[PDB]
Ligand binder design. Structure first.
Ligand SMILES: *[C@@H](C1CC1)[C@@H](C#N)C(=O)Nc1cc(N2CCC(N3CCOCC3)CC2)cc(F)c1Nc1n[nH]c2ccc(O[C@H](C)c3c(Cl)cncc3Cl)cc12
Length: 300
């Protein structure tokens, strides 16, 4: 009943819905198998993610999903974002089909790969060597920056950039997810805590939190927070600080401390991202180039 866009339209009967990945404020995400996503290979199988309305479905829910779908189309394709693959709008429920990232989000990726503590017994030549190395952590930060740079060039503001919203592929490629969401910026529950204990207010730029102003520079603030997440190996920002205390600390200009085992180069970038004046924060272009220098210097 929605208009037909043969460019993106995909036969729903070529989808086999599987296990649900989670829910959102609007819609739910389900893992699914797709057959012939590449029209040159009609019978080949691929794993995809399918966005769809819940049965909570109001019209505002539908409008938001349609809104997200159309944003996806216009943004285009990039290596470091979750790309649109197709849509199902004819003769059935609305499906928005996007890419699969095998390893989950960046936060859980890092937390599951924290080095072994002093408690597990040494076994082998690499008992002290954890999965995560410094250049790979820098690469993760660099890829997110390039992804955001692309989104910025396409006039897209994420408004909730975080490690939880960055997905990891089988080849450890960072892919920014949920960049085109209507997040209800005029009614945000600042005290809201997610089912996994996340307080999304801790990623908000001051101008976003206090003035409801969003720019690409407000995303840069969030990227600084994400940087802190990465080099704390998936740690929660502002440790032990409730939302009420966050408000007053931010008004006092409080900033997070330099995390352990984090070089000054990267904490420097964090503080730059957290400058009070949005124009005094680096652009994503500058972040990409800054992170590239570090990355190239440690990839001999
Ligand atoms: C690839 C995706 C097409 C489905 C697929 C494979 N293989 C996959 O499942 N990818 C994936 C899985 C997960 N999980 C993390 C939670 C975990 N549960 C089982 C263990 O105990 C409880 C937790 C298994 C499932 C998270 C992921 F982010 C992905 N990757 C992924 N790829 N494309 C996605 C599209 C949307 C999406 O949204 C969900 C709601 C999401 C979750 Cl579940 C977590 N963090 C962020 C987001 Cl956006 C995830 C997508």
């Amino acid at each position: 009943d929605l208009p037909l866009d043969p460019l993106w339209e995909f036969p729903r009967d070529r989808l086999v819905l599987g296990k649900p990945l989670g829910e959102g404020a609007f819609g739910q995400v389900v893992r699914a198998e797709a057959f012939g996503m590449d029209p040159a290979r009609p019978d080949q199988a691929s794993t995809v993610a399918v966005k769809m309305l819940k049965d909570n479905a109001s019209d505002k829910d539908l409008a938001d999903l349609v809104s997200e779908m159309e944003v996806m189309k216009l943004i285009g394709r990039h290596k470091n974002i979750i790309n649109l693959l197709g849509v199902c709008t004819q003769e059935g429920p609305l499906y928005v089909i996007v890419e699969c990232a095998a390893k989950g989000n960046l936060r859980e990726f890092l937390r599951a790969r924290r080095p072994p503590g002093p408690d597990l017994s040494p076994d082998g030549p690499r008992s002290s060597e954890g999965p995560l190395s410094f250049p790979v952590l820098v690469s993760c930060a660099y890829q997110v920056a390039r992804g955001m740079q692309y989104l910025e060039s396409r006039k897209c503001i994420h408004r909730d950039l975080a490690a939880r919203n960055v997905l990891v592929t089988e080849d450890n490629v960072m892919k920014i997810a949920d960049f085109g969401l209507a997040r209800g910026v005029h009614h945000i529950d600042y005290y809201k805590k997610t089912s996994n204990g996340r307080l999304p207010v801790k990623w908000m730029a001051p101008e976003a939190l206090f003035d409801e102003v969003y720019t690409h520079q407000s995303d840069v603030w969030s990227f600084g927070i994400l940087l802190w997440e990465i080099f704390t190996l998936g740690g929660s920002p502002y440790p032990g600080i409730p939302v009420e205390e966050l408000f007053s600390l931010l008004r006092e200009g409080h900033r997070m401390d330099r995390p352990p085992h984090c070089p000054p180069e990267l904490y420097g970038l964090m503080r730059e991202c957290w400058h009070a004046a949005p124009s005094q924060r680096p652009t994503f272009k500058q972040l990409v180039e800054a992170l590239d220098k570090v990355l190239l210097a440690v990839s001999e």
